[PDB]
């Protein structure tokens, strides 16, 4: 088990950066839900 | 009105360019075509110290480049430095150009050279350190080319004479990062960099919340 | 109104607070499905942040 920042870098940061980028581009109506849905639809590409 | 975010990354502009220039799919490489014509980057800077690099990929005989900075009104069908809106550095003999006046500056540059482009636009235009344009060749400061420049927004800019090829690197990683000055990479102007900085700051905060700091 | 905010302020006012707490919870629990855990946290806790 890695340090905190290292652990998040290797698990969720890459996909999170992508979801935040889509969020900032499209400014969708329910951003928290939109971001949660984005993480689920794309989990496999980073899992 | 949706926020005018511009391009996610700093690239060579899609439409703010001479149509005869040949621009790569990744919009970081450009090839000249006949007489001098110009392309600006997709983001420009108004204040602070900023840096980018250009690599001369190929420069056959009888081709040339004038590289540097341009305000939005710089003429796209003229060499860079043709008018009051841009400042440039010429491959041939290292001349610096502004308002079509060429002045001795450095030795020439050419194929394989990696050139650096520094601009500083202090917040205080009266008692600040003074605005400056500085060119670098393969990591070596070539001196202050221009000072007390026209206030405005300055875009990284490339003008090419005939079929030479250059590639622009806005950062964040440079081949010869200057050792003598501080700066932000031009790539910080892409809204994708603002996203990356926002998350990087949040991650630092999370680390404080979870681990503390010593 | 909110579609007009600069990039960082837009994120400030939408997702950063829930992410700030959710990423800390994730970092402490270390569950075996990090991405889905985080997506779950967002959905379970959305109401206190919207």
From Swiss-Prot, chain B:
Locations listed in the record: Nucleus
Domain of life: Eukaryota
BP GO annotations: DNA damage response; hemopoiesis; positive regulation of cell population proliferation; response to estrogen; transcription initiation-coupled chromatin remodeling
PTM annotation, UniProt: Both monomethylated and dimethylated on arginine residues in the C-terminus. Methylation is not required for nuclear localization, nor for MLL complex integrity or maintenance of global histone H3K4me3 levels.
Region (Interaction with RBBP5): 9-214
Main localization of the protein described in the UniProt heading: nucleus
Residue span(s) of domain B30.2/SPRY: 9-175
Nucleotide-binding listed as a keyword: no
Coiled coil: none
Function: Transcriptional regulator. Component or associated component of some histone methyltransferase complexes which regulates transcription through recruitment of those complexes to gene promoters. Component of the Set1/Ash2 histone methyltransferase (HMT) complex, a complex that specifically methylates 'Lys-4' of histone H3, but not if the neighboring 'Lys-9' residue is already methylated. As part of the MLL1/MLL complex it is involved in methylation and dimethylation at 'Lys-4' of histone H3. May play a role in hematopoiesis.
Record's subunit section: Interacts with HCFC1. Core component of several methyltransferase-containing complexes including MLL1/MLL, MLL2/3 (also named ASCOM complex) and MLL4/WBP7.
Protein name: Set1/Ash2 histone methyltransferase complex subunit ASH2
Part of the whole protein covered: 380 to 622 of 628
From Swiss-Prot, chain C:
Localisation: Nucleus; Golgi apparatus, trans-Golgi network
Primary location class: nucleus
Keywords attached to this entry: Acetylation, Chromatin regulator, Golgi apparatus, Isopeptide bond, Nucleus, Phosphoprotein, Transcription, Transcription regulation, Ubl conjugation
Keyword Acetylation: yes
Any single GO CC term annotated in Swiss-Prot or TrEMBL for this entry: histone methyltransferase complex
Keyword Cell membrane applies: no
Function: As part of the MLL1/MLL complex, involved in the methylation of histone H3 at 'Lys-4', particularly trimethylation. Histone H3 'Lys-4' methylation represents a specific tag for epigenetic transcriptional activation. May play some role in histone H3 acetylation. In a teratocarcinoma cell, plays a crucial role in retinoic acid-induced differentiation along the neural lineage, regulating gene induction and H3 'Lys-4' methylation at key developmental loci. May also play an indirect or direct role in endosomal transport.
Quaternary structure and partners: Homodimer. Core component of several methyltransferase-containing complexes including MLL1/MLL, MLL2/3 (also named ASCOM complex) and MLL4/WBP7. Each complex is at least composed of ASH2L, RBBP5, WDR5, DPY30, one or more specific histone methyltransferases (KMT2A/MLL1, KMT2D/MLL2, KMT2C/MLL3 and KMT2B/MLL4), and the facultative components MEN1, HCFC1, HCFC2, NCOA6, KDM6A, PAXIP1/PTIP, PAGR1 and alpha- and beta-tubulin. Interacts with ASH2L; the interaction is direct. Interacts with ARFGEF1.
Family that this chain belongs to: Belongs to the dpy-30 family.
Protein known as: Protein dpy-30 homolog
Species of the source: Homo sapiens (Human)
């Amino acid at each position: 088990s890695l340090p905190t920042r290292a652990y998040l870098d290797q698990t969720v940061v890459p996909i999170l950066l992508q979801g935040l980028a889509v969020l900032a581009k499209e400014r969708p109506p329910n951003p928290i839900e939109f971001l949660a849905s984005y993480l689920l639809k794309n989990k496999a590409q980073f899992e | 009105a949706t926020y005018a975010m511009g391009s996610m990354r700093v690239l060579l502009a899609l439409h703010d360019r001479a149509p005869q220039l040949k621009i790569s799919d990744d919009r970081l490489t450009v090839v000249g075509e006949k007489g001098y014509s110009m392309v600006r980057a997709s983001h420009g800077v108004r204040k602070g110290a900023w840096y980018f690099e250009i690599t001369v990929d190929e420069m056959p005989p009888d081709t040339a480049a004038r590289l540097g900075w341009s305000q939005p009104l710089g003429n796209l069908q003229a060499p860079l430095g043709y008018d009051k809106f841009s400042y440039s550095w010429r491959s041939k003999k290292g001349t610096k150009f502004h308002q079509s006046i060429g002045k001795h500056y450095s030795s020439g540059y050419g194929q394989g050279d990696v050139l650096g482009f520094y601009i500083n636009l202090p917040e205080d235009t009266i008692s600040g350190r003074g605005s400056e344009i500085i060119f670098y060749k393969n990591g070596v400061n070539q001196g202050v080319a221009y000072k007390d420049i026209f206030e405005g927004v300055y875009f990284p800019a490339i003008s090419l004479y005939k079929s030479c090829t250059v590639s622009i690197n806005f950062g964040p990683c440079f081949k010869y990062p200057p050792k003598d000055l501080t700066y932000r990479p031009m790539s910080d102007m892409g809204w994708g960099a603002v996203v990356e900085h926002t998350l990087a700051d949040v991650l630092y905060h999370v680390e404080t919340e979870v681990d503390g700091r010593r």
